Design a protein around this ligand. Structure first.
Ligand SMILES: COc1ccc(C2=NN(C3CCCCCC3)C(=O)[C@@H]3CC=CC[C@H]23)cc1OCCN1CCNC1=O
Ligand SMILES: [Mg+2]
Ligand SMILES: [Zn+2]
Length: 329
């Protein structure tokens, strides 16, 4: 259970002059303009969610929401990219897709609450190593994945820890729900987290696009779940949709993390993909262009054109940053 001093250090932070709901919100500046960035990161998620009125509508008390955010924070490690700031960023970004991009019309209010909560658990206990690393090294989590027949090594791990956090009534943000609602909350959270495995990127993307070939049915379960998976995925790959100074800082962080994995693979005598090679060097600009061309740009263009017209800015900023990385060359 959380200490009173730990809760007070977060509770006391407010943002009257910095709008945490804006598409231009700068998390790097929020971290850099305080001596307690992990407390400010937790307060951003706390104030964003209480500010929405969503937890209150689903019987999640302020204290339970805070206990939950701090329990999540405790399970994030000191790695360059997959740290607590990434999930706070994903939470904030998804909030913009829902309420600035109008995707809230495509989901129920409960599903919006579930998605924002899911953003905070989606990478619990990441060590800055991808799924492939655990399998190539025969690490315990890889062995567990292989034996249990689940190829999403880390995503299943993230689900286990999410369920553990929520098993404590004092951090159960779904504790105010009952019956079908409570079942939907756990089921949707788990499916959203499992949808973040990038080995399944094209699978989830094309499954969504095909269900959207026939008129979107907001009355349908599969339709809303696929929208939730697509929005979780969109937040995960949203660093390319931000202002350049921000998008560049995310690129630096992911590069440093990837390079540390590559150094660990070199030390262990396992295969190193060029993207993870520290000593060998690739231009940051080349890496981001590749990521945009083969992953981010087709994903956002396709989801915007099929249904998410309000998220058109994601397509525009991706091109703006892509053209900026071309100039950096
Ligand atoms: C800010 O830039 C990036 C942010 C996140 C990612 C992710 N990639 N993937 C894979 C990596 C393999 C190749 C394509 C498929 C995506 C993941 O599974 C990560 C975890 C989940 C979601 C996306 C994350 C990648 C980025 O730049 C890549 C370009 N590179 C890599 C090194 N530098 C650089 O610019
Ligand atoms: Mg992940
Ligand atoms: Zn993530």
């Amino acid at each position: 259970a959380i200490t009173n001093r730990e809760r007070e250090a977060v509770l006391r932070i407010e943002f009257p002059n910095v709008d945490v709901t804006d598409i231009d919100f700068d998390l790097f500046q929020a971290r850099e303009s305080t001596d307690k960035p992990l407390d400010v990161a937790a307060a951003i998620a706390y104030r964003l969610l209480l500010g929405s009125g969503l937890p209150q509508k689903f019987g999640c008390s302020d204290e339970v929401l805070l206990n939950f955010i701090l329990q999540c924070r405790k399970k994030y490690r000191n790695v360059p990219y997959h740290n607590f700031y990434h999930v706070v960023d994903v939470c904030q970004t998804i909030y913009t897709f829902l309420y600035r991009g109008n995707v809230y019309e495509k989901l129920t209010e409960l599903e919006c609450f579930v998605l924002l909560i899911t953003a905070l658990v989606h990478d619990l206990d990441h060590m800055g190593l991808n799924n492939s690393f655990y399998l190539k090294t025969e690490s315990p989590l890889g062995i567990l994945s292989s034996a249990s027949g689940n190829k999403s090594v880390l995503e299943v791990h993230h689900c286990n820890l999410a369920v553990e956090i929520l098993s404590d009534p004092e951090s159960d943000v779904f504790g105010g729900l009952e019956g079908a609602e409570r079942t939907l909350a756990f089921r949707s959270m788990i499916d959203c987290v499992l949808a973040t495995d990038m080995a399944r990127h094209s699978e989830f993307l094309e499954k969504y696009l095909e269900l959207m070939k026939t008129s979107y049915n907001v009355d349908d379960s599969d339709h809303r779940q696929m929208t939730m998976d697509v929005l979780m995925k969109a937040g995960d790959i949203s660093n390319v949709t931000k202002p350049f100074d921000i998008s560049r800082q995310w690129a630096m962080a992911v590069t440093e993390e990837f390079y540390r994995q590559g150094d660990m693979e070199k030390e262990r005598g396992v295969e190193v993909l060029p993207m993870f090679d520290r000593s060998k060097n690739m231009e940051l600009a080349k890496g981001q262009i590749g990521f945009i061309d083969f992953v981010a740009a087709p994903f956002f263009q396709k989801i915007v054109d099929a249904c998410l017209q309000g998220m058109q800015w994601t397509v525009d900023r991706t091109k703006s940053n892509r053209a900026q990385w071309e100039r950096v060359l």
